[PDB]
Amino acid sequence: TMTQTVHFQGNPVSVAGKLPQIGDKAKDFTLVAKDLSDVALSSFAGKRKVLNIFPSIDTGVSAASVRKFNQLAGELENTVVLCISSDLPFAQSRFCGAEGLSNVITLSTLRGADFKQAYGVAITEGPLAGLTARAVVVLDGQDNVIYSELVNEITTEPNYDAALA
Amino acid sequence: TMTQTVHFQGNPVSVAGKLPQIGDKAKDFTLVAKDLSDVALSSFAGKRKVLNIFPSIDTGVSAASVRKFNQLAGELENTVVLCISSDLPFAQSRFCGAEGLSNVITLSTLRGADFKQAYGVAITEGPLAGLTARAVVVLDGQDNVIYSELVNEITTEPNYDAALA
């Protein structure tokens, strides 16, 4: 079993598996949409993917990342932004409905919990155990990894400008 | 494996296990609190428990039940109301913080997913799969079941007045 290390403020927390690095082929996942429908990664074939992985959408830092990726989604070409978290579809829907975000597509780990182990983002120990770590993974049309970032510390935002290819 | 049957509007959905009926001894569970601390059922020993189990706190019907149980919690004697759902602690905290509910204690199935199987409330199939069914379980000081209700249909509220002993 592979082990990664991130932190909250300054507290080492173990992450199961490893984030798919450059050149690797990302595993096909199936997650719950806003209308409780199972949406797979294979449905976005031919289109570029930006996977925004965060602990919870109700937290302060992660709420800013969804709003940021929503605004730059209109600037992107042939790209769909997929906000993935441990939140339920209802918690993700009430946020996007109140903030007026329509460009992003929310995905829930309610069904498809194996996503955490396949992408190496599952938090093993601590108070954040069971949640997903802060990560940004950029994919092409054929699910090949072009960009992948595992943010060393949870409180700081991932790099949005470097995610561009 | 035992199988129970409830529905959404009029669509039969299978529930794994069975709700602990009258006379049975309820299993000890450990769930996540609002401050990300693991709180067990053994911590409320000597006190009477009212377990409010619902799919999601962001849904319309379940939001009314939490508000109802919060108002009658001040009327109850030696009783703690535990709102249990598949929601994250952050989604439960933002609701109670905005509505001004303080009498209820929110518990998350983020850690302690075995609660669903032990109490027989896990939804097996359909769009609501992975979530908890609508149930109200009343316990005494020694975790013995005094009242238990599995609401036949999700959209209708559980009986609050009959839950009193």
Numbering used by the authors:
A (entry chain A), B (entry chain A): 0 to 164
The authors write:
Tpx constitutes part of the bacterial defence system against reactive oxygen species (ROS) and, correspondingly, is upregulated when E. coli is exposed to oxidative stress. Atypical 2-Cys peroxiredoxins are functionally monomeric, in contrast to the typical peroxiredoxins, i.e. the resolving (Cr) and the peroxidasic (Cp) cysteines (C61 and C95, respectively in the case of Tpx) are situated on the same subunit. Tpx contains three cysteine residues, two of which (C61and C95) form the redox active disulphide bond. ypTpx has a regular thioredoxin-like fold: a seven-stranded β-sheet, with β2 and β6 running anti-parallel to the rest, although with an inserted N-terminal β-hairpin (βN1-βN2) absent from other peroxierdoxins.
As part of this study, the structure of ypTpxC61S was solved to a resolution of 2.55 Å in space group P64. This structure represents the “forced” reduced form of the protein, as the resolving cysteine has been mutated to a serine, rendering it catalytically inactive. The C61S mutant Tpx is present only in its reduced form and cannot undergo the intramolecular disulphide bond formation critical for the catalytic cycle of the protein. All of our solution data indicate that the mutant structure and the reduced wild type structure are identical, and that the oligomeric states are the same. This fits well with the structural analysis of Hall et al. who used the TpxC61S mutant from E. coli to describe the structure of reduced Tpx. The dimer interfaces are identical in the structures of reduced Tpx and C61S. In comparison, the purified C61S mutant was present only as a monomer of 21 kDa. This difference can be attributed to the changes in the strength of the dimer interface, arising from the loss of two salt bridges in the ‘forced’ reduced C61S mutant, which in turn is more susceptible to the heat and detergent experienced during the far-western blotting procedure.
